[PDB]
Design a protein around this ligand. Structure first.
Ligand SMILES: Cc1n[nH]c(C)c1-c1ccccc1N
Ligand SMILES: Cc1n[nH]c(C)c1-c1ccccc1N
Ligand SMILES: [Cl-]
Ligand SMILES: [Mg+2]
Ligand SMILES: [Mg+2]
Ligand SMILES: [Mg+2]
Ligand SMILES: [Mg+2]
Lengths: 194, 194
């Protein structure tokens, strides 16, 4: 019933662009919407977010998270390991690559989501949420070495799965950090499931 | 270690603006970052709220109440948590309860409210409070929930069981052409993994 009529370019940067989307509402009236987009997409989605489950025997299962300075936020944020998918790359391969680059861990694919939207009121940005198990007992994951690219500066924070929300709340309280919405939504559901 | 140096405007629309952010990296080098921001924010702790509405009913499995909406940036329909911006002077809990009633028709009760969490921190400064709300479906006020949508709002309600959320979300994705929200998918994945 609703559909895109046309798109006007307001201001295109190098990486980000701002468009004025004109769309048909379900009654019949025409309405406008300043939509946001990325220029880097070719591709199933823009990027991937890795839910990395660190499994070590006789230890609590941990979720591997990344702390980075984020200039749009103007501060540090706790997030799932993540990054854009390169040209000629399946979402599963981008997940294992980004996981190793940012954390140093070599993981195995458990499952992969379809394209899911990030902030659909604001932007068109999508990701594949990729669940990855990491064998922490394997010798390749004994001394994990992050391989950061030019510009990335990532700090690894592994928190136990069984108390993820409470440990995230503790980090917000004593270090002024902004936890990611998807990380928080995941941590909430872990507690709510019971 | 890392901090904001300056923020110069590239373009400002009625609702969204694009800024050229300059920041210091941890090696001591100056770098730039195109950052997206909303013009509607002012004194609020976050831009908006996302409602995780747990519909509770005697001799019913708990349901998560979701909303289906055409989203002009995505160019199609999206399945999301009920959500909207926080009005000036409005507390996050009141915004959550109002938006839930407007989009679904349900009168909820506050369970818990998250701190400000980032929506897409590589792209924008946008934040929300994730407000968990219980809905007493046995109450007479929640018997015939009538959505009260504002100007330009056209919301359909989709209530799915909590114990089978991910599979029911996948079943909707296979049947029709629509995108599931990343926070909703993250929530459903956690319910599986717990
Ligand atoms: C979403 C949303 N919530 N509140 C407003 C004013 C918007 C908006 C409207 C058109 C284009 C971009 C926006 N960010
Ligand atoms: C995020 C991200 N992934 N890849 C690039 C080039 C960006 C980016 C960098 C600075 C400002 C805006 C952006 N979208
Ligand atoms: Cl798993
Ligand atoms: Mg990254
Ligand atoms: Mg990387
Ligand atoms: Mg809304
Ligand atoms: Mg609304």
């Amino acid at each position: 019933k609703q559909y895109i009529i046309s798109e006007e370019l307001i201001s295109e940067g190098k990486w980000v662009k701002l468009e004025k989307t004109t769309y048909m509402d379900p009654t019949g009236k025409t309405r406008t919407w300043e939509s946001v987009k990325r220029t880097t997409r070719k591709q199933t989605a823009d990027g991937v977010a890795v839910i990395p489950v660190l499994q070590r025997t006789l230890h609590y299962e941990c979720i591997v998270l990344v702390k980075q300075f984020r200039p749009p936020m103007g501060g540090y944020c706790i997030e799932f390991p993540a990054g854009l998918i390169d040209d000629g790359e399946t979402p599963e391969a981008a997940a294992l690559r980004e996981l190793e680059e940012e954390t140093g861990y070599k993981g195995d694919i458990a499952e992969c989501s379809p394209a899911v939207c990030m902030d659909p009121g604001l932007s068109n940005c999508t990701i594949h949420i990729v669940t990855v198990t990491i064998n922490g007992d394997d010798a390749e994951n004994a001394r994990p070495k992050p391989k950061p690219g030019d510009g990335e500066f990532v700090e690894v924070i592994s928190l136990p799965k069984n108390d993820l929300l409470q440990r995230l709340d503790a980090l917000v309280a004593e270090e002024h950090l902004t936890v990611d919405a998807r990380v928080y939504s995941y941590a909430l559901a872990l507690k709510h499931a019971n």
